[PDB]
Amino acid sequence: NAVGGLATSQIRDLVGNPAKSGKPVVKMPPYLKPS
């Protein structure tokens, strides 16, 4: 598991996967609900 003394996988899971911020959600007026 440790590659040269480093738990790289663990580090990856803590460093290599930042969260991605997507488009803001638009609140739908009730009269636009019908498809």
């Binding site: 598991n1 590659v3 790289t8 996988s9 991605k20 997507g22």
Partner: protein
Amino acid sequence: MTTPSLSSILRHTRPIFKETLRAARPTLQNALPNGFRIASESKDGDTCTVGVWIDAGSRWETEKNNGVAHFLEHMNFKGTGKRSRQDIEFGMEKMGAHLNAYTSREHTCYYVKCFKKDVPEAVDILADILLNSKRTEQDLDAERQTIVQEKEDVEARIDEVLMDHLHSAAFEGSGLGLSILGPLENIQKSITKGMIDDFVKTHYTGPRMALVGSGAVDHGQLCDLASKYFGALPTGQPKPSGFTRFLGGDKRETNQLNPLTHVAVAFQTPGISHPDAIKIKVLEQLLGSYSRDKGEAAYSCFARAIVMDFYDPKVGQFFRPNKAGHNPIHSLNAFWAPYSDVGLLGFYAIAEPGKSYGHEWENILHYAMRELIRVSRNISEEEFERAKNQLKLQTMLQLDGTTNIADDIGRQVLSFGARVPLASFFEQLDAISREDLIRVAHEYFYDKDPVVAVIGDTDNVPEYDALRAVTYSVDL
């Protein structure tokens, strides 16, 4: 500007083209009785690229499993019967290497760069993931969101979206005109383990796979490993041979808030294995490329014709001068996208949208189509020589590094059946006649239906009908 320009008075010295031809070691090739191919090019060094090239892209999907190829690529890395994902990553890390998977419309490849001492282990891992990988539903359900994020990310690349538009417009009704990742609704709900298993069974066969080695590698060792691991692949049914019809037309996305407009115009050409392949390559290099940093220093009749109208004072007898404020062209590039059946040869122009209801794009496309007609009618010997020399250099520029050499070997093995020696290729490049090039240009450009893709302010880009009326001239 009180400083004189002596360049207008001086006699300048012209450099001439003189090629360098270093003899590379020949590309050895063998084939198991199963049909699986093994290609290798060895060179002195300490590192080697070893990979598997597969001849099954997204070209073989019917909109019911679109994107299944990419799903399979993501699923191969989630663990096999013997190893797990953690074990595969640990093996790669111990080797100090990365395992790269690339998926295109008609090719996929899994390759590893390593030292010559890790070749057997790399081949073992490649065979393990390709053949023995278990693709369960749970993992299939755990990758849907990552693939959705990848879809949303690749949708933000303007060049990729433009080429997807061009292919969707050109090839409608066949998998060659579908996006690699596929519809979002397919990513989230439709693609299933059954579809993935069918795709793998149908398209991962012996005669459609090659093991490529480049760099400090041993061909005999590669052959032994290939027999050990890849000798059991089935001799499945042959690659589908259908008719992919080209549909002239247009795909235009309107986004007036974009800072630049991208316009690609392409024409139908024969496949990559057609004898006209070299002539089409020479045509592509004849149209050339142009970047804004060059200014008026455009080396081709094509780009130059499109650029000098933004430097011309345009003084006339009965009309006021109309000189453009500045050159709006960001870039012009001639491209050829070939496929075993068909091809798309054309140009790709990026320029500012300009004043609303202006004439910039009208002029750009006017002169582009005029130059296409002109080259269809007559080509000069000096520009013919320039195009051939540039094709030589461009072909050589793509072979930088073991990974690039291996990619070239694999693509040529999958397409032509064997790698063409560069000298042999060059032998066919000095035998091209200007008349033959003119005939090829006239066959596919003059009075033909193009396919247009537009992204940006479509308020100023001419519509298809007008563009269809400028592929011919009254004088002829």
